[PDB]
């Protein structure tokens with residue numbers, strides 16, 4: 001009638017009643033412990049800073065919202081939970097939120113109108129009372145001893161921003177499934193999140209301790225833990241971002257560049273319900289992405305626009321207060337981030353005309369592992385690099401490592417060969433034509449052509465209508 005109640009006495013049958021398989025689960029339903037064996041018995045500390053848990057939402061399924069909430073209360077030592085702040089971001093039925101205010105520790109905040117996730121998180125952060133923030137989606141389920149490992153890290157160094165491994169809760173059947181602990185957040189020049197294997201070096205490093213924290217260039221997304229002061233000092237979130245994501249890019253760039261670090265803490269596990277086709281699970285409105293790139297990427301932004309020319313036409317708002325933030329924080333340049341934080345991301349030479357994979361539909365130019373005077377071919381694109389990595393240079397050659405596509409015989413039907421690059425060589429000079437849709441051999445009417453793949457390899461051929469002569473570099477600078 002007016003009282004707060006302990007989570008087990010909450011009337012879930014009532015709340016939920018008033019995909020579907022969500023309402024079938026109990027609010028405190030059991031889930032497999034997906035942790036490494038060594039997390040089992042590590043001894044976590046009593047003397048850790050309590051946290052305010054901000055969960056922001058807009059028309060979340062009640063069964064899932066509730067499940068997140070109890071998940072936190074059930075699996076976190078209660079002395080480390082100061083409060084759980086739910087930010088209702090103008091859900092249509094205010095009751096979805098307000099009803100949960102009845103539970104111990106929960107506090108619910110309402111928005112007049114859709115403010116989006118960024119602004120909602122800032123609201124929750126501001127309302128928080130604890131020294132440390134924990135942000136979670138409205139559809140998560142925390143696993144055993146999920147919280148202590150995160151807090152241990154920020155307690156020790158305020159400038160760490162730490163994420164759990166994010167397990168997967170299936171959107172259809174709600175099976176809780178363990179994710180890998182052997183991956184890092186990354187991206188391609190199109191600023192699309194991808195997962196990376198660890199440094200063959202980094203793997204060795206971890207032999208002595210397989211559950212050690214792991215530095216990550218790019219945050220997996222929204223579940224993370226951060227000192228409240230630090231959060232505010234580094235400028236919170238970009239309040240001008242619209243509700244379509246890519247705040248992950250901006251926060252990752254900002255923390256790293258401005259002196260902080262990002263981490264993934266393998267002993268910390270939180271399930272998440274992934275939407276269909278989300279970039280975490282399946283391998284673009286650019287506003288937010290441009291706001292990141294135009295403030296943080298210095299001149300490398302031009303590789304983003306090389307990958308995504310469409311994006312140069314997307315208006316992105318005023319970024320002045322953000323540029324000023326960067327100045328004040330004396331943040332290091334993007335060049336530094338690439339060299340120190342994400343050296344494995346392949347960066348074109350600043351005088352390369354085009355770079356990346358050279359693809360024809362969904363096939364990619366491939367060396368076939370043919371390291372000297374070899375013929376060349378195609379494989380299905382795999383968006384790793386290696387044998388599928390090429391550049392069009394200032395010198396006008398199509399090169400992979402220090403080998404160059406070479407017209408060895410100008411007769412139509414002649415196979416091209418991969419030879420050592422020489423700037424002398426007229427036989428290794430190529431140019432883009434027809435709006436960067438083909439490769440013509442400079443000084444001829446010969447075009448790179450896959451007609452012959454099944455019969456020897458790629459060939460030079462008289463430039464024509466053939467679609468076996470269509471080739472697009474992933475990045476073009478013209």
Ligand SMILES: CC(=O)N[C@H]1[C@@H](OP(=O)(O)OP(=O)(O)OC[C@H]2O[C@@H](n3ccc(=O)[nH]c3=O)[C@H](O)[C@@H]2O)O[C@H](CO)[C@H](O)[C@@H]1O
Nearest residue numbers: 056057058089116117120137220221222223243244245272
């Ligand atoms: C587990 C994880 O890493 N999740 C991230 C991922 O979430 P998801 O892609 O799973 O989406 P989400 O869970 O953040 O939100 C679900 C939908 O409701 C919207 N919504 C949600 C809350 C809110 O306060 N206001 C609002 O408008 C949101 O715009 C989205 O379309 O991608 C997001 C980019 O947008 C953020 O990086 C999330 O934190």
Ligand SMILES: [Mn+2]
Nearest residue numbers: 137139272273
């Ligand atoms: Mn989500």
